[PDB]
Write a protein that binds this ligand. Structure first.
Ligand SMILES: Nc1ccn([C@H]2C[C@H](O)[C@@H](COP(=O)(O)CP(=O)(O)OP(=O)(O)O)O2)c(=O)n1
Ligand SMILES: [Mg+2]
Ligand code: NA
Length: 343
DNA sequence: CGCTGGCAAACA
DNA sequence: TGTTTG
DNA sequence: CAGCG
Protein backbone atom coordinates (compact mmCIF):
# COMPACT_ATOMS: atom_id res chain seq x y z
CA UNK A 1 0.00 0.00 0.00
CA UNK A 2 2.85 2.55 0.73
CA UNK A 3 4.79 3.48 -2.44
CA UNK A 4 8.62 3.58 -2.51
CA UNK A 5 8.24 6.92 -4.49
CA UNK A 6 7.69 10.29 -2.60
CA UNK A 7 5.58 11.64 -5.53
CA UNK A 8 3.13 8.73 -4.91
CA UNK A 9 2.58 9.60 -1.21
CA UNK A 10 1.39 12.58 0.97
CA UNK A 11 3.98 14.13 3.32
CA UNK A 12 2.69 16.98 5.42
CA UNK A 13 4.65 18.78 8.12
CA UNK A 14 3.24 16.49 10.88
CA UNK A 15 6.10 14.03 11.51
CA UNK A 16 5.19 11.30 14.04
CA UNK A 17 8.54 9.51 13.61
CA UNK A 18 10.88 12.45 14.27
CA UNK A 19 12.96 10.38 16.80
CA UNK A 20 13.55 7.79 14.02
CA UNK A 21 13.99 10.32 11.14
CA UNK A 22 16.52 12.50 13.07
CA UNK A 23 18.78 9.43 13.51
CA UNK A 24 18.43 8.35 9.82
CA UNK A 25 19.31 11.93 8.61
CA UNK A 26 22.53 11.73 10.65
CA UNK A 27 23.44 8.26 9.15
CA UNK A 28 22.68 9.60 5.63
CA UNK A 29 24.97 12.63 6.33
CA UNK A 30 27.83 10.34 7.53
CA UNK A 31 27.60 8.20 4.37
CA UNK A 32 27.53 11.41 2.23
CA UNK A 33 30.71 12.60 4.03
CA UNK A 34 32.34 9.10 3.63
CA UNK A 35 31.09 9.33 -0.05
CA UNK A 36 29.14 5.97 -0.08
CA UNK A 37 26.30 7.37 -2.29
CA UNK A 38 24.06 4.27 -2.30
CA UNK A 39 24.01 3.86 1.50
CA UNK A 40 23.41 7.67 1.94
CA UNK A 41 20.40 7.61 -0.46
CA UNK A 42 18.97 4.51 1.31
CA UNK A 43 18.94 6.33 4.70
CA UNK A 44 17.44 9.41 2.92
CA UNK A 45 14.71 7.26 1.27
CA UNK A 46 13.89 5.62 4.62
CA UNK A 47 13.83 8.94 6.62
CA UNK A 48 11.41 10.28 3.88
CA UNK A 49 9.02 7.26 3.98
CA UNK A 50 8.74 7.59 7.88
CA UNK A 51 7.81 11.33 7.49
CA UNK A 52 4.77 10.29 5.32
CA UNK A 53 3.38 8.00 8.03
CA UNK A 54 0.12 9.32 9.60
CA UNK A 55 1.23 7.55 12.81
CA UNK A 56 4.30 6.87 15.04
CA UNK A 57 6.21 3.55 14.99
CA UNK A 58 5.96 1.97 18.48
CA UNK A 59 6.63 -1.74 17.55
CA UNK A 60 8.57 -3.65 14.82
CA UNK A 61 5.19 -4.92 13.48
CA UNK A 62 4.67 -1.28 12.32
CA UNK A 63 7.69 -1.54 9.88
CA UNK A 64 6.03 -4.51 8.03
CA UNK A 65 5.04 -3.61 4.43
CA UNK A 66 6.92 -0.26 4.52
CA UNK A 67 9.22 0.18 1.48
CA UNK A 68 12.83 1.58 1.76
CA UNK A 69 13.23 -0.45 5.01
CA UNK A 70 15.66 -3.37 4.72
CA UNK A 71 17.79 -5.17 7.31
CA UNK A 72 20.12 -2.28 8.35
CA UNK A 73 17.33 0.42 8.78
CA UNK A 74 15.01 -2.11 10.58
CA UNK A 75 17.90 -2.70 13.08
CA UNK A 76 18.26 1.14 13.54
CA UNK A 77 14.45 1.44 14.21
CA UNK A 78 14.66 -1.54 16.68
CA UNK A 79 17.43 0.27 18.65
CA UNK A 80 15.31 3.45 19.05
CA UNK A 81 12.25 1.26 20.05
CA UNK A 82 14.12 -0.61 22.87
CA UNK A 83 16.29 2.35 24.08
CA UNK A 84 14.64 5.56 22.79
CA UNK A 85 18.11 6.55 21.53
CA UNK A 86 20.21 5.36 18.53
CA UNK A 87 23.77 4.18 19.45
CA UNK A 88 24.84 4.37 15.73
CA UNK A 89 23.57 7.96 15.24
CA UNK A 90 25.04 9.12 18.62
CA UNK A 91 28.52 7.82 17.56
CA UNK A 92 28.37 9.95 14.34
CA UNK A 93 27.51 13.16 16.33
CA UNK A 94 30.77 12.71 18.36
CA UNK A 95 32.98 11.96 15.27
CA UNK A 96 35.51 14.76 14.59
CA UNK A 97 35.32 14.44 10.75
CA UNK A 98 31.48 14.79 11.00
CA UNK A 99 31.62 17.75 13.49
CA UNK A 100 34.03 19.59 11.06
CA UNK A 101 31.87 18.62 8.01
CA UNK A 102 28.72 20.12 9.65
CA UNK A 103 30.71 23.25 10.73
CA UNK A 104 32.58 23.84 7.41
CA UNK A 105 29.54 23.14 5.17
CA UNK A 106 27.39 25.62 7.26
CA UNK A 107 29.28 28.27 5.19
CA UNK A 108 27.50 29.18 1.92
CA UNK A 109 29.78 28.13 -0.95
CA UNK A 110 31.57 25.28 0.96
CA UNK A 111 30.57 21.65 0.26
CA UNK A 112 31.86 18.13 1.08
CA UNK A 113 35.19 18.35 -0.90
CA UNK A 114 36.61 21.65 0.56
CA UNK A 115 35.38 20.61 4.10
CA UNK A 116 37.28 17.29 3.66
CA UNK A 117 40.29 19.27 2.24
CA UNK A 118 40.36 21.70 5.21
CA UNK A 119 39.99 18.82 7.73
CA UNK A 120 42.97 17.01 5.95
CA UNK A 121 45.05 20.26 6.20
CA UNK A 122 44.36 20.33 9.97
CA UNK A 123 41.51 22.87 10.25
CA UNK A 124 39.02 22.56 13.13
CA UNK A 125 37.60 26.13 13.65
CA UNK A 126 35.96 28.50 11.06
CA UNK A 127 38.20 31.36 12.43
CA UNK A 128 41.54 29.62 11.52
CA UNK A 129 40.36 29.16 7.85
CA UNK A 130 39.37 32.90 7.67
CA UNK A 131 42.68 33.96 9.32
CA UNK A 132 44.98 32.36 6.66
CA UNK A 133 47.23 33.78 3.88
CA UNK A 134 47.34 30.90 1.34
CA UNK A 135 43.69 29.83 0.95
CA UNK A 136 42.00 30.98 -2.27
CA UNK A 137 38.26 31.35 -1.58
CA UNK A 138 35.54 31.40 -4.24
CA UNK A 139 33.28 34.51 -4.60
CA UNK A 140 30.52 32.34 -3.01
CA UNK A 141 32.71 31.46 0.07
CA UNK A 142 33.78 35.13 0.38
CA UNK A 143 29.97 35.97 0.58
CA UNK A 144 29.35 32.94 2.85
CA UNK A 145 32.01 34.23 5.36
CA UNK A 146 30.94 37.91 5.03
CA UNK A 147 27.25 37.30 5.93
CA UNK A 148 27.74 34.00 7.92
CA UNK A 149 25.68 34.97 11.07
CA UNK A 150 22.64 36.19 9.02
CA UNK A 151 23.00 33.23 6.56
CA UNK A 152 22.99 30.46 9.23
CA UNK A 153 19.90 32.01 10.92
CA UNK A 154 16.83 30.75 9.01
CA UNK A 155 14.33 32.92 7.11
CA UNK A 156 10.98 33.06 8.97
CA UNK A 157 7.47 33.82 7.55
CA UNK A 158 7.48 37.67 8.27
CA UNK A 159 10.90 37.90 6.42
CA UNK A 160 9.75 35.78 3.36
CA UNK A 161 6.67 38.10 3.12
CA UNK A 162 8.87 41.27 3.18
CA UNK A 163 11.12 39.67 0.48
CA UNK A 164 7.86 38.95 -1.51
CA UNK A 165 7.01 42.70 -1.20
CA UNK A 166 10.52 43.66 -2.55
CA UNK A 167 10.44 41.21 -5.54
CA UNK A 168 6.80 42.13 -6.52
CA UNK A 169 7.72 45.86 -6.28
CA UNK A 170 10.85 45.36 -8.50
CA UNK A 171 9.04 43.10 -11.09
CA UNK A 172 5.86 45.29 -11.35
CA UNK A 173 8.01 48.32 -12.39
CA UNK A 174 9.48 46.44 -15.45
CA UNK A 175 6.60 44.01 -16.28
CA UNK A 176 3.30 45.16 -14.56
CA UNK A 177 1.37 42.09 -15.94
CA UNK A 178 3.82 39.54 -14.30
CA UNK A 179 2.73 36.82 -11.81
CA UNK A 180 5.07 36.35 -8.81
CA UNK A 181 4.66 33.08 -6.86
CA UNK A 182 6.56 32.00 -3.79
CA UNK A 183 7.88 28.47 -4.46
CA UNK A 184 10.25 26.20 -2.40
CA UNK A 185 9.73 25.39 1.28
CA UNK A 186 7.44 28.35 2.05
CA UNK A 187 4.92 27.18 -0.70
CA UNK A 188 4.94 23.72 1.05
CA UNK A 189 3.50 25.50 4.15
CA UNK A 190 6.80 25.71 6.04
CA UNK A 191 7.18 28.47 8.62
CA UNK A 192 11.03 28.64 8.21
CA UNK A 193 13.44 28.23 5.28
CA UNK A 194 17.15 28.61 4.46
CA UNK A 195 16.21 30.98 1.58
CA UNK A 196 13.10 32.35 -0.26
CA UNK A 197 12.20 30.96 -3.72
CA UNK A 198 10.16 32.70 -6.40
CA UNK A 199 8.76 31.94 -9.83
CA UNK A 200 8.07 34.93 -12.13
CA UNK A 201 5.84 34.61 -15.26
CA UNK A 202 4.03 36.86 -17.86
CA UNK A 203 1.35 36.01 -20.48
CA UNK A 204 1.74 39.42 -22.28
CA UNK A 205 5.48 40.36 -22.77
CA UNK A 206 10.72 41.56 -23.22
CA UNK A 207 10.67 38.79 -20.55
CA UNK A 208 14.15 37.63 -21.85
CA UNK A 209 15.89 40.09 -19.45
CA UNK A 210 13.43 40.82 -16.55
CA UNK A 211 15.74 39.21 -13.91
CA UNK A 212 18.62 41.29 -15.21
CA UNK A 213 16.39 44.48 -14.95
CA UNK A 214 15.22 43.53 -11.35
CA UNK A 215 18.76 42.75 -10.08
CA UNK A 216 20.21 45.97 -11.58
CA UNK A 217 17.32 47.82 -9.78
CA UNK A 218 18.45 46.29 -6.43
CA UNK A 219 22.13 47.13 -7.25
CA UNK A 220 21.15 50.83 -7.77
CA UNK A 221 19.61 50.69 -4.22
CA UNK A 222 22.70 48.93 -2.74
CA UNK A 223 20.64 45.81 -1.89
CA UNK A 224 22.39 43.26 -4.16
CA UNK A 225 25.08 41.76 -1.86
CA UNK A 226 25.76 38.80 -4.19
CA UNK A 227 24.27 37.60 -7.51
CA UNK A 228 24.74 34.66 -9.88
CA UNK A 229 22.84 34.98 -13.17
CA UNK A 230 21.65 32.00 -15.23
CA UNK A 231 20.00 31.85 -18.70
CA UNK A 232 18.83 29.33 -21.46
CA UNK A 233 17.39 28.84 -25.00
CA UNK A 234 4.62 20.66 -29.04
CA UNK A 235 6.96 22.08 -26.27
CA UNK A 236 10.15 23.10 -28.34
CA UNK A 237 13.40 24.77 -26.83
CA UNK A 238 13.67 27.21 -23.79
CA UNK A 239 13.28 31.05 -23.22
CA UNK A 240 14.33 30.55 -19.48
CA UNK A 241 16.09 32.87 -16.89
CA UNK A 242 17.34 32.33 -13.25
CA UNK A 243 18.96 34.70 -10.66
CA UNK A 244 20.41 33.53 -7.35
CA UNK A 245 20.99 36.53 -5.01
CA UNK A 246 21.86 37.55 -1.46
CA UNK A 247 19.70 40.55 -0.65
CA UNK A 248 20.09 43.21 2.03
CA UNK A 249 16.67 43.28 3.86
CA UNK A 250 16.15 46.35 6.18
CA UNK A 251 14.37 45.40 9.48
CA UNK A 252 11.86 48.25 8.75
CA UNK A 253 10.47 46.12 5.87
CA UNK A 254 9.73 43.23 8.34
CA UNK A 255 6.72 43.37 10.76
CA UNK A 256 19.79 44.88 20.28
CA UNK A 257 18.85 45.70 16.64
CA UNK A 258 22.33 47.00 15.75
CA UNK A 259 23.04 46.57 11.99
CA UNK A 260 19.69 47.69 10.53
CA UNK A 261 19.35 44.86 7.96
CA UNK A 262 19.66 41.03 7.38
CA UNK A 263 21.33 39.23 4.42
CA UNK A 264 18.85 36.74 2.86
CA UNK A 265 19.32 34.27 -0.04
CA UNK A 266 16.71 34.78 -2.79
CA UNK A 267 16.24 32.40 -5.72
CA UNK A 268 14.33 33.97 -8.63
CA UNK A 269 13.31 31.74 -11.51
CA UNK A 270 11.62 33.14 -14.67
CA UNK A 271 9.93 31.09 -17.34
CA UNK A 272 7.39 31.57 -20.24
CA UNK A 273 3.68 31.55 -19.14
CA UNK A 274 3.02 28.26 -21.08
CA UNK A 275 5.89 26.55 -19.10
CA UNK A 276 4.54 27.70 -15.63
CA UNK A 277 3.05 24.35 -14.39
CA UNK A 278 6.39 22.51 -14.94
CA UNK A 279 8.40 25.27 -13.21
CA UNK A 280 5.93 25.36 -10.27
CA UNK A 281 6.22 21.57 -9.94
CA UNK A 282 10.02 21.69 -10.35
CA UNK A 283 10.74 24.51 -7.90
CA UNK A 284 8.12 23.79 -5.15
CA UNK A 285 10.00 20.65 -4.21
CA UNK A 286 10.90 19.02 -1.95
CA UNK A 287 14.24 17.76 -3.38
CA UNK A 288 13.15 14.14 -2.48
CA UNK A 289 9.74 14.71 -4.15
CA UNK A 290 11.61 15.93 -7.33
CA UNK A 291 14.14 13.09 -7.47
CA UNK A 292 11.24 10.57 -7.02
CA UNK A 293 9.05 12.38 -9.69
CA UNK A 294 11.95 11.81 -12.13
CA UNK A 295 12.60 8.24 -10.90
CA UNK A 296 8.90 7.26 -11.16
CA UNK A 297 8.43 8.92 -14.62
CA UNK A 298 11.42 7.13 -16.21
CA UNK A 299 10.94 3.68 -14.48
CA UNK A 300 7.13 3.40 -14.25
CA UNK A 301 5.87 5.50 -17.16
CA UNK A 302 8.75 5.55 -19.80
CA UNK A 303 8.52 9.35 -19.58
CA UNK A 304 11.05 12.13 -18.99
CA UNK A 305 10.22 14.99 -16.62
CA UNK A 306 12.15 18.21 -16.15
CA UNK A 307 11.42 21.66 -14.77
CA UNK A 308 10.25 22.75 -18.28
CA UNK A 309 8.40 19.79 -19.92
CA UNK A 310 7.21 16.14 -19.81
CA UNK A 311 8.12 13.88 -22.72
CA UNK A 312 6.45 10.51 -23.50
CA UNK A 313 9.20 8.22 -24.89
CA UNK A 314 6.77 5.58 -26.36
CA UNK A 315 4.48 8.14 -28.17
CA UNK A 316 7.53 10.41 -28.94
CA UNK A 317 5.43 13.46 -27.95
CA UNK A 318 5.71 16.25 -25.35
CA UNK A 319 2.69 16.20 -22.99
CA UNK A 320 1.19 19.66 -22.47
CA UNK A 321 -0.11 20.89 -19.08
CA UNK A 322 -1.79 24.16 -17.95
CA UNK A 323 -1.63 23.19 -14.22
CA UNK A 324 0.37 20.93 -11.78
CA UNK A 325 -2.80 18.72 -11.71
CA UNK A 326 -2.42 18.03 -15.49
CA UNK A 327 1.24 16.91 -14.98
CA UNK A 328 0.14 14.47 -12.21
CA UNK A 329 -2.78 13.22 -14.43
CA UNK A 330 -0.36 12.65 -17.40
CA UNK A 331 2.03 10.71 -15.09
CA UNK A 332 -0.83 8.54 -13.71
CA UNK A 333 -0.50 10.02 -10.20
CA UNK A 334 -3.05 11.24 -7.65
CA UNK A 335 -2.56 14.99 -7.18
CA UNK A 336 -0.35 15.82 -4.21
CA UNK A 337 -0.97 19.32 -2.77
CA UNK A 338 2.16 21.57 -2.20
CA UNK A 339 1.89 21.19 1.63
CA UNK A 340 1.80 17.34 1.05
CA UNK A 341 5.24 17.45 -0.76
CA UNK A 342 7.38 17.67 2.43
CA UNK A 343 9.19 14.41 1.62
C1' DC B 1 23.90 -11.33 -8.27
C1' DG B 2 24.83 -6.97 -10.51
C1' DC B 3 23.21 -2.53 -11.60
C1' DT B 4 20.70 1.88 -10.34
C1' DG B 5 19.99 5.47 -7.39
C1' DG B 6 17.42 13.03 -10.21
C1' DC B 7 18.64 16.87 -12.11
C1' DA B 8 20.78 21.59 -14.15
C1' DA B 9 24.07 25.41 -14.47
C1' DA B 10 27.75 28.78 -12.81
C1' DC B 11 32.33 29.42 -11.24
C1' DA B 12 37.52 28.38 -10.82
C1' DT C 1 35.86 20.32 -15.19
C1' DG C 2 35.32 19.38 -10.68
C1' DT C 3 32.72 21.54 -7.09
C1' DT C 4 28.75 23.63 -5.24
C1' DT C 5 24.61 25.65 -5.60
C1' DG C 6 19.35 25.53 -6.34
C1' DC D 1 21.58 0.42 1.77
C1' DA D 2 17.31 -1.14 -0.78
C1' DG D 3 14.60 -2.60 -4.93
C1' DC D 4 14.23 -4.53 -9.38
C1' DG D 5 14.82 -7.51 -13.27
N1 LIG E 1 18.89 19.49 -4.64
C1 LIG E 1 17.87 20.27 -5.03
C2 LIG E 1 17.60 21.50 -4.36
C3 LIG E 1 16.52 22.20 -4.75
N2 LIG E 1 15.68 21.73 -5.74
C4 LIG E 1 14.37 22.40 -6.06
C5 LIG E 1 13.20 21.96 -5.17
C6 LIG E 1 13.17 23.05 -4.12
O1 LIG E 1 11.91 23.20 -3.46
C7 LIG E 1 13.55 24.28 -4.92
C8 LIG E 1 14.18 25.37 -4.10
O2 LIG E 1 15.36 24.83 -3.45
P1 LIG E 1 15.83 25.14 -1.98
O3 LIG E 1 17.29 24.96 -1.90
O4 LIG E 1 15.48 26.64 -1.69
C9 LIG E 1 15.07 24.22 -0.90
P2 LIG E 1 13.71 24.08 -0.07
O5 LIG E 1 13.97 23.23 1.15
O6 LIG E 1 12.66 23.54 -0.94
O7 LIG E 1 13.44 25.52 0.54
P3 LIG E 1 13.86 26.15 1.94
O8 LIG E 1 14.38 25.17 2.93
O9 LIG E 1 12.58 26.89 2.43
O10 LIG E 1 14.90 27.18 1.55
O11 LIG E 1 14.51 23.80 -5.88
C10 LIG E 1 15.97 20.53 -6.40
O12 LIG E 1 15.16 20.09 -7.22
N3 LIG E 1 17.09 19.83 -6.04
MG1 LIG F 1 13.96 27.61 -0.26
NA1 NA G 1 27.71 25.00 2.43
Amino acid sequence: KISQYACQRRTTLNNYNQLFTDALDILAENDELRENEGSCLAFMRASSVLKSLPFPITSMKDTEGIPCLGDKVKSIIEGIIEDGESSEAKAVLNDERYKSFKLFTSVFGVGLKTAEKWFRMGFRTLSKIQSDKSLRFTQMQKAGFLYYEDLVSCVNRPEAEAVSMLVKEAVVTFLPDALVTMTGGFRRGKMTGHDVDFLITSPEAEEQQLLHKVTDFWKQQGLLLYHQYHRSHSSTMDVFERSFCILKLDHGRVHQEGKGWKAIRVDLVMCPYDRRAFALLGWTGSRQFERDLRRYATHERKMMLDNHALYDRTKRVFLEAESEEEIFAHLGLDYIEPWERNA
